Amino acid sequence: KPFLEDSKYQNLLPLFVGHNMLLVSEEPKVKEMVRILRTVPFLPLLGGCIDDTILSRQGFINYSKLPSLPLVQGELVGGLTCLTAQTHSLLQHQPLQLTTLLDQYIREQ
Amino acid sequence: AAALARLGLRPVKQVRVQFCPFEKNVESTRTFLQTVSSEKVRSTNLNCSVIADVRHDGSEPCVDVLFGDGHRLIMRGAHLTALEMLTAFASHIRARDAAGS
Amino acid sequence: EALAGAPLDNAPKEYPPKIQQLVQDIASLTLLEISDLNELLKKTLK
Amino acid sequence: YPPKIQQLVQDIASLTLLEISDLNELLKKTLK
Amino acid sequence: PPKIQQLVQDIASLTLLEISDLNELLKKTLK
Amino acid sequence: YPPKIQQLVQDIASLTLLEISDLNELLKKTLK
Amino acid sequence: PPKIQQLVQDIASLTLLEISDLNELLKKTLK
Amino acid sequence: PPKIQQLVQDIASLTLLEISDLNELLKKTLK
Known part of the structure; x- marks a missing residue:
């Protein structure tokens, strides 16, 4: 508690009433930890701090459900093509309509 | 823990512990959870489920106890001590057991 | 110098003012500048 | 190449995984 | 180019609400 | 109806076929 | 080509009412 | 309308051999 008061983790003080234990890893392994903790129904997850961001129990649950960072990095890259294809698709109706008409002409013959 | 283990959890079906760990009035509820979550207390009845619900809604802590007879015991630890809740919890066990048998 | 508290689950979505x-x-920036920015970002992230 | 870019x-x-998701969600909604 | x-x-420059109106013309009227 | 679009x-x-093709080429190739 | x-x-340049005639022929008359 | x-x-009216040239522009020149 004296450590937390003088450090940046001042909002973690209420979480340390009574018996407490710390589950810490060099990298975020929330999804692995949660399923192991779910095996014990009476063990509570009081929250904590991930990457200098204090989160509650639901924050850890949401963090685990969030996809991996490399996939999230590519989502911004993936969205760039959507912006470019948006304007292109506006004028793409005419080529699609013309192709269908030509195909039907052969079928009727 | 020792006193509660002697009585046992035979007439208790499910114990639900709801509290917000970031609040300043949940210390008593957490102390109650520690006593109930003890191995000695839980070993008395393996059919009794102890559930700890952690929420960040700011609501006052509450403890819900469900017995085999269907009666519910609700103790609100916002202004109650751990010892008082344990005594009330023990008294209901000593009474619900007699009614069932 | 102190981390902000965890927002409530029932609270509406909130975004930090830095973002x-x-x-x-x-x-504000034009697409041509962003397109050049996008090209550098894709190679940098790889 | 420009210093602003x-x-x-x-x-x-530099943004973390949690912080990036907040930025990504806002940009898509603002564009639409 | 002097067009793009x-x-x-x-x-x-268009506001968030006016983007939907622009999209509707380019998505429904032109289809 | 904004005063720009x-x-x-x-x-x-008003564009002709030759000028349209060059305009479409920039979007498809220069920006991609 | 001049035809295209x-x-x-x-x-x-076709009006909204005139476009519907073209759409009806393709979806109904040709099908 | 007269245009359609x-x-x-x-x-x-176009012959089958000359049809291929028209279809090539749509699929290749425009794409």
């Missing part, structure tokens, strides 16, 4: 400044900057 | 490169990579 | 550059200024 | 719409109709 | 150039200009 | 009626006649 708000970045959002307005992106809209 | 180079500045945004550092900011985007 | 002016296009970018239009999207940025 | 109106000019762009009118320009497209 | 004529068609593109006509479609844009 | 002219387009239908031209397609049927």
Whole structure:
């Protein structure tokens, strides 16, 4: 508690009433930890701090459900093509309509 | 823990512990959870489920106890001590057991 | 110097003010500058 | 290559996984 | 080009509500 | 009807086939 | 080709009521 | 409208060998 008061983790003080234990890893392994903790129904997850961001129990649950960072990095890259294809698709109706008409002409013959 | 283990959890079906760990009035509820979550207390009845619900809604802590007879015991630890809740919890066990048998 | 508290589950979605400044900057820049920015970002992230 | 463009490169990579998701959600909604 | 550059200024200047109206004409009227 | 997109719409109709092809090439190739 | 150039200009200039005639023929008369 | 009626006649009048040239522009020149 004296450590937390003088450090940046001042909002973690209420979480340390009574018996407490710390589950810490060099990298975020929330999804692995949660399923192991779910095996014990009476063990509570009081929250904590991930990457200098204090989160509650639901924050850890949401963090685990969030996809991996490399996939999230590519989502911004993936969205760039959507912006470019948006304007292109506006004028793409005419080529699609013309192709269908030509195909039907052969079928009727 | 020792006193509660002697009585046992035979007439208790499910114990639900709801509290917000970031609040300043949940210390008593957490102390109650520690006593109930003890191995000695839980070993008395393996059919009794102890559930700890952690929420960040700011609501006052509450403890819900469900017995085999269907009666519910609700103790609100916002202004109650751990010892008082344990005594009330023990008294209901000593009474619900007699009614069932 | 002190981390903000965890927002409530029932509270509406809230975004830190630091990100708000970045959002307005992106809209100001032209697509040609962003397209050159996008090319550098894709190689940098790899 | 422009100094202003180079500045945004550092900011985007520096943001954490949780912080990036907040930025990504806002940008898509603002564009639409 | 003197055409694509002016296009970018239009999207940025339009308000969030007016983007939907622009999209509707380009998505429904032109289809 | 903003006072900017109106000019762009009118320009497209006035463009010829050769000028349209060059305009479409920039979007498809230069920006991709 | 001149044939394609004529068609593109006509479609844009057609009114909303006139476009419906073209759409009806393709979806119904040709099917 | 007269513009659409002219387009239908031209397609049927073209021979099969000359049809391939028209279809090539749509699929390759425009794409």
